[PDB]
Coordinates of all heavy atoms in Angstrom, one line a residue:
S486 N 0.8 -1.2 0.0 CA 0.0 0.0 0.0 C 0.9 1.2 0.0 O 1.8 1.4 0.8 CB -0.9 0.0 1.3 OG -1.5 1.2 1.6
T487 N 0.7 2.2 -1.0 CA 1.6 3.3 -1.2 C 0.8 4.7 -1.0 O 1.4 5.7 -1.2 CB 2.4 3.3 -2.5 OG1 1.4 3.3 -3.6 CG2 3.2 2.1 -2.6
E488 N -0.5 4.6 -0.7 CA -1.2 5.9 -0.4 C -0.5 6.8 0.5 O -0.5 8.1 0.1 CB -2.5 5.5 0.1 CG -3.6 6.7 0.1 CD -4.6 6.5 1.1 OE1 -5.2 5.3 1.3 OE2 -5.1 7.5 1.8
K489 N 0.1 6.4 1.5 CA 0.8 7.2 2.4 C 2.3 6.9 2.6 O 2.9 7.2 3.5 CB 0.2 7.1 3.9 CG -1.3 7.6 3.9 CD -1.7 7.6 5.5 CE -2.9 8.5 5.6 NZ -4.0 8.4 4.7
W490 N 2.9 6.7 1.3 CA 4.3 6.5 1.2 C 5.1 7.8 1.3 O 6.0 8.0 1.9 CB 4.7 5.8 -0.1 CG 6.2 5.8 -0.3 CD1 6.9 6.5 -1.3 CD2 7.2 5.0 0.3 NE1 8.3 6.2 -1.3 CE2 8.5 5.2 -0.2 CE3 7.1 4.0 1.5 CZ2 9.6 4.6 0.2 CZ3 8.3 3.4 1.8 CH2 9.6 3.7 1.1
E491 N 4.5 8.9 0.7 CA 5.0 10.2 0.7 C 4.9 11.0 2.0 O 3.8 11.1 2.6 CB 4.4 11.1 -0.4 CG 4.9 10.7 -1.9 CD 6.4 10.8 -2.2 OE1 7.0 11.6 -1.5 OE2 6.9 10.0 -2.9
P492 N 5.9 11.6 2.6 CA 5.9 12.4 3.8 C 4.8 13.5 3.9 O 4.3 13.7 4.9 CB 7.4 12.9 3.9 CG 8.2 11.9 3.3 CD 7.3 11.3 2.1
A493 N 4.6 14.1 2.7 CA 3.5 15.0 2.6 C 2.0 14.6 3.1 O 1.2 15.4 3.4 CB 3.3 15.7 1.2
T494 N 1.8 13.3 3.1 CA 0.6 12.7 3.4 C 0.5 12.3 4.9 O -0.6 11.8 5.4 CB 0.3 11.3 2.7 OG1 1.3 10.4 3.0 CG2 0.3 11.6 1.1
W495 N 1.6 12.4 5.6 CA 1.6 12.0 7.1 C 1.1 13.1 8.0 O 1.1 14.3 7.6 CB 3.0 11.7 7.5 CG 3.8 10.7 6.7 CD1 3.3 9.8 5.8 CD2 5.2 10.4 6.7 NE1 4.2 9.0 5.2 CE2 5.5 9.4 5.8 CE3 6.2 10.9 7.5 CZ2 6.7 8.8 5.6 CZ3 7.5 10.4 7.2 CH2 7.7 9.4 6.4
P496 N 0.5 12.8 9.1 CA 0.2 13.7 10.2 C 1.5 14.4 10.5 O 2.6 13.8 10.6 CB -0.3 12.9 11.4 CG -0.7 11.5 10.8 CD 0.3 11.3 9.6
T497 N 1.5 15.7 10.8 CA 2.7 16.5 11.2 C 3.2 16.0 12.6 O 4.5 15.9 12.7 CB 2.3 18.0 11.5 OG1 2.0 18.7 10.2 CG2 3.5 18.8 12.1
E498 N 2.4 15.4 13.4 CA 2.9 14.8 14.7 C 2.0 13.6 14.9 O 0.8 13.7 15.0 CB 2.7 15.9 15.8 CG 3.3 15.5 17.1 CD 3.2 16.6 18.2 OE1 2.9 17.8 17.9 OE2 3.4 16.2 19.4
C499 N 2.6 12.5 15.2 CA 1.9 11.2 15.5 C 2.9 10.3 16.2 O 4.0 10.4 16.3 CB 1.3 10.6 14.2 SG 2.5 10.3 12.8
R500 N 2.3 9.2 16.7 CA 3.1 8.2 17.4 C 2.4 6.9 17.4 O 1.2 6.8 17.1 CB 3.3 8.6 19.0 CG 2.0 8.6 19.8 CD 2.3 9.2 21.1 NE 1.2 8.9 22.0 CZ 1.3 8.9 23.4 NH1 2.4 9.5 24.0 NH2 0.3 8.5 24.1
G501 N 3.2 5.8 17.5 CA 2.6 4.5 17.4 C 3.5 3.4 18.1 O 4.6 3.7 18.5
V502 N 2.9 2.2 18.1 CA 3.5 1.1 18.9 C 3.5 -0.1 17.8 O 2.4 -0.3 17.3 CB 2.8 0.7 20.2 CG1 3.6 -0.4 20.9 CG2 2.6 1.9 21.1
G503 N 4.6 -0.8 17.7 CA 4.7 -2.1 17.0 C 5.1 -3.1 17.9 O 6.0 -2.9 18.7
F504 N 4.3 -4.1 18.0 CA 4.6 -5.3 18.9 C 4.6 -6.6 18.3 O 3.8 -6.8 17.3 CB 3.7 -5.2 20.2 CG 2.2 -5.6 19.9 CD1 1.9 -7.0 20.0 CD2 1.3 -4.7 19.4 CE1 0.6 -7.4 19.7 CE2 0.0 -5.1 19.2 CZ -0.4 -6.4 19.3
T505 N 5.3 -7.6 18.8 CA 5.3 -8.9 18.4 C 5.8 -9.8 19.5 O 6.2 -9.4 20.5 CB 5.9 -9.2 17.0 OG1 5.6 -10.4 16.5 CG2 7.4 -9.1 17.1
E506 N 5.8 -11.2 19.2 CA 6.5 -12.1 20.0 C 7.7 -12.6 19.3 O 7.6 -13.4 18.3 CB 5.7 -13.3 20.4 CG 4.6 -13.0 21.5 CD 5.2 -12.6 22.8 OE1 6.1 -13.3 23.2 OE2 4.9 -11.5 23.4
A507 N 8.9 -12.1 19.7 CA 10.2 -12.6 19.1 C 10.5 -14.0 19.6 O 9.7 -14.4 20.6 CB 11.3 -11.6 19.4
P508 N 11.4 -14.7 19.1 CA 11.6 -16.1 19.7 C 12.0 -16.1 21.1 O 11.5 -17.0 21.8 CB 13.0 -16.5 18.9 CG 12.7 -15.9 17.5 CD 12.1 -14.5 17.8
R509 N 12.5 -15.0 21.7 CA 12.8 -15.0 23.2 C 11.7 -14.3 24.0 O 11.9 -14.2 25.2 CB 14.2 -14.3 23.4 CG 15.4 -15.1 22.8 CD 16.5 -14.3 22.4 NE 17.6 -15.1 21.8 CZ 17.5 -15.5 20.5 NH1 16.6 -15.0 19.7 NH2 18.5 -16.3 20.1
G510 N 10.7 -13.7 23.3 CA 9.5 -13.2 24.2 C 9.0 -11.8 23.7 O 9.2 -11.5 22.4
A511 N 8.3 -11.1 24.5 CA 7.5 -9.9 24.2 C 8.5 -8.7 23.7 O 9.3 -8.3 24.4 CB 6.7 -9.4 25.4
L512 N 8.2 -8.2 22.5 CA 9.0 -7.1 21.8 C 8.1 -6.0 21.5 O 7.0 -6.1 21.0 CB 9.6 -7.7 20.5 CG 10.4 -6.6 19.7 CD1 11.5 -5.9 20.5 CD2 10.9 -7.2 18.3
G513 N 8.5 -4.8 21.9 CA 7.8 -3.6 21.6 C 8.8 -2.5 21.0 O 9.8 -2.3 21.6
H514 N 8.3 -1.7 20.1 CA 8.9 -0.5 19.6 C 7.9 0.6 19.6 O 6.8 0.5 19.1 CB 9.4 -0.6 18.1 CG 10.6 -1.6 17.8 ND1 11.4 -1.5 16.7 CD2 11.1 -2.6 18.5 CE1 12.3 -2.4 16.7 NE2 12.2 -3.1 17.8
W515 N 8.3 1.7 20.4 CA 7.5 2.9 20.5 C 8.1 4.0 19.7 O 9.3 4.3 20.0 CB 7.4 3.2 22.0 CG 6.5 2.3 22.9 CD1 5.2 2.6 23.4 CD2 6.8 1.1 23.4 NE1 4.7 1.6 24.1 CE2 5.7 0.7 24.2 CE3 8.0 0.2 23.4 CZ2 5.7 -0.6 24.9 CZ3 7.9 -1.0 24.0 CH2 6.8 -1.4 24.7
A516 N 7.4 4.6 18.8 CA 8.0 5.6 17.9 C 7.1 6.8 17.9 O 5.9 6.7 17.8 CB 8.0 5.0 16.5
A517 N 7.7 8.1 18.0 CA 7.0 9.3 17.8 C 7.6 9.9 16.5 O 8.8 10.1 16.4 CB 7.0 10.2 19.0
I518 N 6.7 10.4 15.6 CA 7.1 11.1 14.4 C 6.7 12.6 14.5 O 5.6 12.9 14.9 CB 6.5 10.5 13.2 CG1 6.8 9.0 13.0 CG2 6.7 11.4 11.9 CD1 6.0 8.3 12.0
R519 N 7.6 13.5 14.1 CA 7.3 14.9 14.1 C 8.0 15.5 12.8 O 9.1 15.3 12.6 CB 7.8 15.6 15.4 CG 7.2 17.0 15.5 CD 7.7 17.7 16.7 NE 7.8 19.1 16.5 CZ 7.7 20.0 17.4 NH1 7.5 19.7 18.7 NH2 7.9 21.3 17.1
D520 N 7.2 16.3 12.1 CA 7.8 17.0 10.9 C 8.6 16.0 10.0 O 9.7 16.3 9.5 CB 8.6 18.1 11.3 CG 7.9 19.1 12.3 OD1 6.8 19.5 12.0 OD2 8.5 19.2 13.4
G521 N 8.1 14.8 9.7 CA 8.6 13.8 8.8 C 9.8 13.1 9.2 O 10.4 12.3 8.5
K522 N 10.2 13.3 10.6 CA 11.4 12.5 11.1 C 11.0 11.9 12.4 O 10.1 12.3 13.2 CB 12.6 13.6 11.3 CG 12.9 14.5 10.1 CD 13.5 13.4 9.0 CE 13.9 14.4 7.7 NZ 14.4 13.5 6.7
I523 N 11.9 10.9 12.8 CA 11.8 10.2 14.1 C 12.2 11.3 15.2 O 13.3 11.7 15.3 CB 12.6 9.0 14.2 CG1 12.2 7.9 13.1 CG2 12.7 8.4 15.6 CD1 10.7 7.4 13.4
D524 N 11.2 11.5 16.1 CA 11.3 12.5 17.3 C 11.9 11.6 18.5 O 12.7 12.1 19.2 CB 10.2 13.2 17.6 CG 10.4 14.7 17.8 OD1 11.1 15.3 17.1 OD2 9.9 15.2 18.9
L525 N 11.3 10.3 18.5 CA 11.7 9.4 19.7 C 11.5 8.0 19.1 O 10.6 7.7 18.4 CB 10.7 9.7 20.9 CG 10.8 8.7 22.1 CD1 10.7 9.4 23.4 CD2 9.7 7.5 21.9
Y526 N 12.4 7.1 19.6 CA 12.3 5.7 19.2 C 12.7 5.0 20.3 O 14.0 4.9 20.7 CB 13.2 5.5 17.9 CG 12.6 4.2 17.2 CD1 11.8 4.4 16.0 CD2 12.9 2.9 17.7 CE1 11.5 3.2 15.3 CE2 12.3 1.8 17.0 CZ 11.6 2.0 15.8 OH 11.2 0.8 15.1

């Protein structure tokens, strides 16, 4: 899906969580995006 591939289509400020079960257990990545770049990871 490429609808929101371009940075111009993103919210100016947003954040998200990606989670899964890696072989060794619970994995989480917490990301905040601002002005098209990673603000926090």
Side-chain angles (χ1 to χ4, degrees):
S486 159
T487 62
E488 190 198 324
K489 292 189 157 52
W490 174 253
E491 290 295 333
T494 64
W495 305 343
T497 292
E498 189 176 343
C499 57
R500 66 190 200 166
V502 186
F504 72 90
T505 191
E506 288 293 313
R509 295 152 184 84
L512 174 60
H514 286 202
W515 285 258
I518 299 170
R519 195 179 145 155
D520 310 305
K522 308 292 178 182
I523 298 299
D524 224 47
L525 173 142
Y526 203 106

